[PDB]
Design a protein around this ligand. Structure first.
Ligand SMILES: *[C@@H]1O[C@H](CO[C@@H]2O[C@@H](C)[C@@H](O)[C@@H](O)[C@@H]2O)[C@@H](O[C@@H]2O[C@H](CO)[C@@H](O[C@@H]3O[C@H](CO)[C@@H](O)[C@H](O)[C@@H]3O)[C@H](O)[C@H]2NC(C)=O)[C@H](O)[C@H]1NC(C)=O
Ligand SMILES: *[C@@H]1O[C@H](CO)[C@@H](O)[C@H](O)[C@H]1NC(C)=O
Lengths: 49, 50
């Protein structure tokens, strides 16, 4: 019962964090900094933090 | 560039290639030892290392 209770609050945080990793992509157009790069469409609305 | 008048002037269009140059600056680190390690030569080596 404890496992069934905590699995409702373990899974969506994991899904949200892997979606956060899916929004970023290690790419480099031309003489870039060879990192960062997020898709504007895949993030929606966000702040600086 | 027009190749017909360039053929008239005496130039012939050769091969076309790409410019796939430079890349990501990933690095690695190694160790270069200078003094060779002798172990079987503990009998007759004198002090030629010095
Ligand atoms: C998070 O990302 C992973 C990895 O996918 C990569 O990133 C995405 C954002 C896209 O840009 C992808 O093109 C890119 O590869 C996603 O995992 C992938 O999920 C899909 C389904 O959404 C899987 O495809 C399935 O694969 C098999 C084929 O036999 C069948 O079950 C299905 O027909 C279906 O095609 C895919 O295999 C899987 N992995 C990879 C490496 O692409 C993931 O979905 C994504 N988002 C979330 C919310 O989890
Ligand atoms: C030579 O050196 C090797 C490697 O250290 C060692 O196994 C071997 O016993 C040595 N042989 C002699 C005759 O000293």
């Amino acid at each position: 019962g404890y496992l069934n209770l905590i699995n409702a609050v373990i899974i969506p945080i994991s899904q949200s964090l892997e979606l956060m990793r899916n929004n970023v992509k290690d790419g480099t157009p031309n003489e870039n900094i060879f990192g960062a790069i997020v898709a504007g469409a895949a993030l929606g609305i966000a702040t600086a933090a | 560039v027009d190749f017909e008048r360039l053929a008239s002037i005496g130039g012939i269009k050769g091969h076309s290639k790409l410019y796939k140059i430079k890349g990501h600056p990933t690095t690695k680190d190694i160790v270069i030892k200078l003094v060779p390690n002798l172990n079987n030569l503990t009998v007759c080596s004198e002090m030629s290392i010095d």
